[PDB]
Design a protein around this ligand. Structure first.
Ligand SMILES: Cc1ccc(-n2nc3ccc(NC(=O)COc4ccccc4C)cc3n2)cc1
Ligand SMILES: Cc1ccc(-n2nc3ccc(NC(=O)COc4ccccc4C)cc3n2)cc1
Lengths: 194, 194
C-alpha cells in the first residue's frame, strides 16, 4: 500500500538522478517499484504527479527545518544566524538535487508545481522580511530598501545560484564555495548602510 | 531577401508577445511575414532557429551597450556607475521581454541557446569581476569574497530577479522597484567590509 507508494517515489528519485522526467515512463516507474502499470495508476494519476509529491516532500522538509531553527533562538552572531538559515536550503536541496532540479523544469509545464513553488517562495520571503524587520526594530540593521523587496531579490539569488551550483552550470559558483558566497551578499546587503 | 528575413524576425517577436514558441508554427511565421512555408525554410531551418537569431541580436545589443559604457569613463559616483551598468540589462531586456523570456525557456531544449546564454554570462561575469578587482586595486573596495565568485552570484541574482519582474512572477519585485533593489545589493556587497 504505502510502501508500494514509497517505492514508486524512491524509484522516481533514483531515475531522476540519471535522466529528466521526459525520459522516464510510467512503465519505468512501475518496473522499478515492482508493480504493474495499472497498479501504478492506483497510486498516482501520472508521472508528473509523482514529481509533485517528491517536490512537495522536499519543500516541506526545508520549511520544517527552517521552522525548527526559528523556534530555537540559536546562539551566535548575526552572520552565523543568516548562514544557518541559508544552510537549510543548501543541505536540503543539495540532498535532493535531482528532484529539486526536475521541479524547476516542471514549473513551466505544470501549474500545480508552479503554484507549489510560488507558495513556498512567498512564505520564505515573508519570513526573511520579518527577520530583517526585527533586525531593523532592534537597531541592528539600517532602514534601506523595503524589507520585502530586499528579501525577494535575496531569495531569488539563492534559488538561481544554488540551482546553477547543483546543476553544475556554466557559469556557477563551486558548490564548496556557494554557501560562503551567498552569506556574504545577504549579510552585507542586510546590514550595509552603503 | 534580408527584409523577408527581418519580417520573419519581427513576426516571431510580435507573436512571442502573446504565446510561447510551442504555440507558434512555422506556418504562423510564414503567414505573418507574407511568405509561403517553403520560402520560410530558405531563411531559417526552423522556428527554434528564429528564436536563436532574435536572442542573439538582443544579447549582442546588451553587450554592445555595455562595451559603450565601458569605453566611455562616465562621470559620477560608484553607486551610479553600477546603476548605469545594471540599467543596460534592465532597458535592453525590458525592451525585449518576450524574446528574452523565450530564450530562458529554450535553454532547456536547445543546446545552441544554452551555449549562447552561457557564453555571454561568462563574458559579463568576467567583466564584472575585472571592475570589482579594479575597485579593489584603487582601494575603493575591500578584498572580501573572490571577485569572480561575487560577480557570478550577483549576475545570477540579476538574471533571475529581472526575469521574475519582467514575467510578472509571483513572487517578484515590481518592475518600477527592481533597478533600485539590485543596485543596493550590488553596491553593499561590493563595498561592504561587512
Ligand atoms: C536546484 C535548486 C536548488 C536550490 C533552490 N533554491 N530555492 C530556494 C529558495 C530560497 C532559498 N533561501 C535561502 O537559501 C535562505 O533563506 C532564508 C534564510 C534565513 C531566513 C529565512 C530564509 C527563507 C534557497 C533556495 N534554493 C531551487 C532549486
Ligand atoms: C527575462 C530575462 C530578463 C533579464 C535577464 N537577465 N540576464 C542577465 C544577466 C546579467 C545581468 N547583469 C546585470 O544586470 C548587471 O551587469 C553588469 C553591471 C556592471 C558591469 C558589468 C555587468 C555585466 C542582467 C541580466 N538580466 C534574463 C532573462
Amino acid at each position: 500500500g504505502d510502501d508500494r507508494e514509497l517505492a514508486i517515489l524512491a524509484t522516481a528519485e533514483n531515475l531522476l538522478e540519471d535522466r529528466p522526467l521526459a525520459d522516464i515512463s510510467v512503465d519505468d516507474l512501475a518496473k522499478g517499484a515492482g508493480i504493474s502499470r495499472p497498479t501504478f495508476y492506483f497510486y498516482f494519476p501520472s508521472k508528473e504527479a509523482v514529481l509533485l509529491t517528491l517536490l512537495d516532500r522536499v519543500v516541506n522538509q526545508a520549511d520544517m527545518a527552517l521552522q525548527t531553527l526559528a523556534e530555537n533562538p540559536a546562539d551566535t552572531d548575526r552572520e552565523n544566524m543568516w548562514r544557518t538559515g541559508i544552510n537549510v536550503f543548501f543541505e536540503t536541496f543539495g540532498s535532493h538535487k535531482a528532484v529539486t532540479r526536475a521541479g524547476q523544469a516542471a514549473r513551466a509545464t505544470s501549474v500545480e508545481v508552479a503554484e507549489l513553488w510560488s507558495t513556498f517562495m512567498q512564505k520564505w520571503i515573508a519570513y526573511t522580511a520579518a527577520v530583517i524587520d526585527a533586525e531593523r526594530d532592534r537597531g541592528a540593521a539600517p532602514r534601506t530598501l523595503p524589507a520585502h523587496e530586499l528579501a525577494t531579490a535575496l531569495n531569488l539569488m539563492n534559488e538561481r545560484t544554488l540551482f546553477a551550483s547543483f546543476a553544475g552550470e556554466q557559469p556557477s559558483v563551486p558548490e564548496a564555495r556557494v554557501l560562503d558566497t551567498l552569506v556574504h551578499i545577504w549579510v552585507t546587503s542586510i546590514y550595509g548602510e552603503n
